[PDB]
Each structure stands twice: as structure tokens, then as C-alpha cells.
Amino acid sequence: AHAFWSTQPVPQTEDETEKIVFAGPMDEPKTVADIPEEPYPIASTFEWWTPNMEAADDIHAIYELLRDNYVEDDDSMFRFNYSEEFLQWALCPPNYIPDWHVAVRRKADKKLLAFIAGVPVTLRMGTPKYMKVKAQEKGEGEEAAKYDEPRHICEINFLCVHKQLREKRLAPILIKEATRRVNRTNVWQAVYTAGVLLPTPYASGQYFHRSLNPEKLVEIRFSGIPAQYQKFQNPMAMLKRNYQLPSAPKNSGLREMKPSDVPQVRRILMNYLDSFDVGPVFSDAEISHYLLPRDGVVFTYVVENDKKVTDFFSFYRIPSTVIGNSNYNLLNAAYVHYYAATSIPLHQLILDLLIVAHSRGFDVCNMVEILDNRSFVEQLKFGAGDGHLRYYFYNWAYPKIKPSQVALVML
Ligand SMILES: CCCCCCCCCCCCCC(=O)SCCNC(=O)CCNC(=O)[C@H](O)C(C)(C)COP(=O)(O)OP(=O)(O)OC[C@H]1O[C@@H](n2cnc3c(N)ncnc32)[C@H](O)[C@@H]1OP(=O)(O)O
Ligand SMILES: O=C(Cc1ccc(F)cc1)Nc1ccc2[nH]cc(C3CCNCC3)c2c1
Numbered sequence: 061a062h063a064f065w066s067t068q069p070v071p072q073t074e075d076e077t078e079k080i081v082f083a084g085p086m087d088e089p090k091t092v093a094d095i096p097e098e099p100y101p102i103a104s105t106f107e108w109w110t111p112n113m114e115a116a117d118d119i120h121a122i123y124e125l126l127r128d129n130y131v132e133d134d135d136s137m138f139r140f141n142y143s144e145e146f147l148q149w150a151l152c153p154p155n156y157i158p159d160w161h162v163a164v165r166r167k168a169d170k171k172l173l174a175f176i177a178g179v180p181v182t183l184r185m186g187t188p189k190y191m192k193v194k195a196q197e198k199g200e201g202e203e204a205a206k207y208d209e210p211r212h213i214c215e216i217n218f219l220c221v222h223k224q225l226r227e228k229r230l231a232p233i234l235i236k237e238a239t240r241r242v243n244r245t246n247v248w249q250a251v252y253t254a255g256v257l258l259p260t261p262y263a264s265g266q267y268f269h270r271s272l273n274p275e276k277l278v279e280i281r282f283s284g285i286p287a288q289y290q291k292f293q294n295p296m297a298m299l300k301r302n303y304q305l306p307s308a309p310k311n312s313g314l315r316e317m318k319p320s321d322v323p324q325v326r327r328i329l330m331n332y333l334d335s336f337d338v339g340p341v342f343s344d345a346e347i348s349h350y351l352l353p354r355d356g357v358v359f360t361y362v363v364e365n366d367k368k369v370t371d372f373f374s375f376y377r378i379p380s381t382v383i384g385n386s387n388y389n390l391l392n393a394a395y396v397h398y399y400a401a402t403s404i405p406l407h408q409l410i411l412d413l414l415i416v417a418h419s420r421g422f423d424v425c426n427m428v429e430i431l432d433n434r435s436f437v438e439q440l441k442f443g444a445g446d447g448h449l450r451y452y453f454y455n456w457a458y459p460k461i462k463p464s465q466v467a468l469v470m471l
């Protein structure tokens with residue numbers, strides 16, 4: 061069924077996943093010295109290339125590969141168009157490993173054919189709360205706690221093979237060579253997501269969308285006018301009124317985050333993320349990197365009460381190419397990132413996110429039902445989208461968990 065995934069250290073079925081009771085590794089313990097020094101063999105007409113993702117011209121070459129060949133919606137109406145600034149941000153967080161960014165190029169002209177990127181993340185990925193309870197009931201607490209400590213692993217994203225090279229088994233070669241380069245740094249697990257089903261997810265969640273510019277969304281067929289609106293004399297007018305938002309934020313003392321906020325945001329975030337079974341641990345440098353505002357890329361606001369940061373939210377921008385509309389070239393989408401509320405209900409905090417995104421010319425706000433994102437779906441008028449984002453580990457057995465126990469946002 062899966063000539064490649066069947067050879068890999070991942071759970072092979074839902075049945076298998078159903079059995080898993082403790083977190084821990086799948087594969088034989090191995091050492092750096094065991095791993096081949098040399099890149100995985102590849103056809104003599106291709107060559108491996110490590111782009112410098114802080115060099116503009118290399119970022120640009122990756123940017124074009126992804127712009128023309130990366131993930132589309134199911135009807136080939138949209139394709140993600142991550143910006144060059146977004147790729148430098150995503151691919152180069154503090155202590156990133158340049159060798160984990162892996163490309164294939166055609167040796168002749170150096171056309172870029174394929175890419176995959178890994179970045180470091182520190183993740184809590186020990187046995188989940190519901191399984192630790194069962195473990196206590198069986199007198200198996202110590203085995204259940206063995207891998208509780210946050211682990212330094214690889215987060216993989218941006219796997220892409222050129223549309224002309226599809227279904228040539230090139231993706232598995234990219235994945236093998238990435239795994240080699242990560243293992244050569246003594247890292248043995250990875251976390252990744254995909255909108256496709258692969259062997260075998262530890263969590264799965266729906267996507268959600270909140271319309272900000274419904275006339276544009278309907279025009280590009282991101283959204284329809286829903287059938288119930290036909291009872292109205294002017295369905296579109298009622299649709300716009302439905303999604304209208306305040307022109308300015310409602311929380312007094314909302315402002316953009318600044319460098320001086322980094323310690324208080326780290327504290328409130330890290331306290332909040334603790335309540336989830338799987339989640340990242342961020343240093344001050346990482347909070348700085350992932351949350352300080354960056355034009356066109358990431359937008360972060362804090363609620364400041366008595367010179368104190370009590371709440372914050374962030375979102376990032378990924379535009380999508382709209383394929384074949386005469387009025388519009390791009391869908392301007394905001395994605396809910398990390399947040400923490402301590403002084404106000406989460407719906408009141410996120411309503412400000414929608415207000416800001418709307419004021420800044422975003423067409424839609426998107427998220428997956430991780431974190432406590434379900435708590436504000438109804439009141440903030442999010443609707444479920446198509447399909448599901450699935451979360452995976454490489455070389456890590458892990459009991460199935462609800463997406464509301466996941467706190468790792470994936471770009
Ligand atoms: C410790 C360190 C470990 C580090 C690595 C951890 C693992 C990281 C794993 C990567 C996490 C990626 C996270 C993301 O970025 S998910 C986003 C993936 N990218 C896209 O969807 C962009 C457009 N599509 C493409 O570029 C290609 O279709 C891709 C590259 C996806 C497949 O290229 P192609 O269509 O030309 O096929 P092939 O003949 O070369 O290969 C066929 C094999 O590939 C398996 N396949 C298909 N889609 C995926 C997929 N999304 N993840 C993993 N495997 C996938 C498939 O089941 C089959 O294996 P098997 O079924 O025969 O066994
Ligand atoms: O934005 C969308 C819908 C869409 C799909 C394909 C397009 F070409 C353009 C738009 N879905 C969506 C909504 C919320 C999300 N939160 C995280 C992701 C994924 C983005 C791609 N990398 C993996 C995470 C994500 C995806």
C-alpha cells in the first residue's frame with residue numbers, strides 16, 4: 061500500500077495507534093557515527109543544494125518553486141503564495157541549522173526541482189494527561205513519565221516537488237536525505253502536519269474560516285452565498301452586514317507588541333500552553349523571533365493593564381494565488397497564531413484580532429481547532445472548511461489526542 065511509509069519508523073495503522081499507551085521512540089537507538097556521512101545517492105542529472113535562506117536570491121528561488129508548485133485547494137482555484145519575507149522568518153529562527161534546508165536542482169541549468177525544510181523546535185511530547193491517568197491505574201507511572209522532558213526535535217514543512225517531476229518517487233528521496241541530515245545532528249524525532257492522510261496521525265482537526273471581505277470571497281469562489289440567504293431580497297447585502305466588524309479595536313490598551321514585552325509574553329504564553337498535551341517551549345529569543353511584529357508577515361498585539369501585559373494575540377499572513385479571476389489575483393488570508401488571555405474572555409480578545417485584520421485589508425481569518433480555538437467559533441462567526449489538518453510525528457509513538465490538546469501552531 062505504501063512502498064515508502066511502510067519502511068519508516070511511524071505507526072502503520074489506526075489499530076496500531078489505538079494500542080499505544082506511552083510516548084516514546086519507535087526505532088532502534090542509533091548514534092551519529094552510525095549515520096552515513098555522504099548525501100543519499102541521487103540521479104547523476106540532479107544534485108543536492110543547501111540554499112542560504114538569509115541570502116535574497118536563494119530565498120527567491122525557493123519562493124518561485126513554492127509559488128508555482130506548492131499546496132492548492134482541491135479545485136485548483138487557489139495555491140499558497142508564501143512571501144520571501146515569510147520564508148526567511150519561518151526558516152531561520154534562532155539556532156536554526158542551515159543544513160536542514162534541503163533542495164534538489166537539475167545539474168545542467170540549476171533549475172530547482174524540489175525542496176523540504178526542517179527547523180528546530182523544543183516540544184513537550186510526553187505521554188498525554190488521559191494516558192497518564194490510565195498508567196497510574198495500572199501502576200505504570202514511571203514508564204508513562206519517562207519522556208516527559210521537553211525534547212529538541214525537527215519541525216518539517218514546505219515539502220514540494222516540481223509539477224513536472226510528480227509521481228517519480230522524488231519525495232521519499234527528499235525525506236530520506238532530510239532525515240539523514242537531522243540524524244547527523246543527533247536529532248531523532250520530527251513533527252509535521254499535512255492536509256492529506258498518511259500513516260498515521262496522532263491528532264486531526266478541521267479548518268475554520270471567518271469571512272472579513274465576503275463580497276471578494278464570494279467573487280473568487282472561496283465562499284458561496286449560502287442557500288438560506290435566498291429568502292432575502294438582497295442576499296449579498298445581508299451577507300456583508302452579517303460579517304461587519306468595528307472599525308477600531310474594542311479593548312482599551314490594545315497596542316502592538318514591542319521588544320520590551322518579550323518576557324511578560326513568554327510567561328503568559330508558556331503558562332497557558334502548559335495546559336495542553338503537545339506544545340512548544342520558547343526561549344525569550346524564540347518569543348522575539350516568532351511574535352515581534354514583522355511587516356507583511358506576523359502581527360502581534362498585547363493588552364496592557366497597569367503597565368502590565370495581561371493578554372495578547374498574534375496572526376500571520378499567507379496570501380494565496382487566485383487562479384483565473386479577472387477582478388482578483390490574490391486572497392489575503394490571516395491565520396490565528398499564538399495567544400493568551402488572562403483578563404478577558406477569549407472571544408473578546410480574538411474579536412480584536414478580527415477587527416485589526418479587517419482594518420489591515422485581510423479577506424479572511426483562518427485557523428485549525430487546536431488550542432482553545434473552538435471556544436470562540438460560534439460567537440465570532442467562524443465556519444468549518446473542507447478537509448482536516450493532521451498532525452504527525454516521525455519516530456515517536458504517541459496515543460491519539462483531541463486537537464484541543466495540541467498547542468503547536470504550524471505555518
Ligand atoms: C528525525 C528527522 C525526520 C525528518 C523527516 C520526517 C518526515 C517528513 C515527511 C514530510 C512531511 C511533509 C509536510 C508537508 O510539507 S505537507 C505539504 C506537502 N506539499 C504539497 O502538498 C505540495 C504539492 N505536492 C507536491 O509537491 C507533491 O505532490 C509531494 C511532494 C507532496 C509528493 O510528491 P509526489 O506527488 O511527486 O509523489 P512521489 O512519487 O514523489 O512520492 C510518493 C510518496 O510520497 C508520499 N507522500 C505524498 N504526499 C506526502 C506528504 N504531504 N507528506 C509525506 N509524504 C507524502 C506518498 O504517500 C508516497 O509514499 P508511499 O505512500 O508510496 O509510501
Ligand atoms: O487557508 C486555507 C484554505 C486554503 C487552502 C489551499 C490554498 F491554496 C489556499 C487556501 N486552509 C488553512 C486554514 C488554516 C490553517 N492553519 C494551518 C494551515 C496549514 C497551512 C499549510 N501548512 C500546514 C498548515 C492552514 C490551512
Ligand SMILES: [Mg+2]
Binds near residue numbers: 221225227228230231
Ligand atoms: Mg516525484
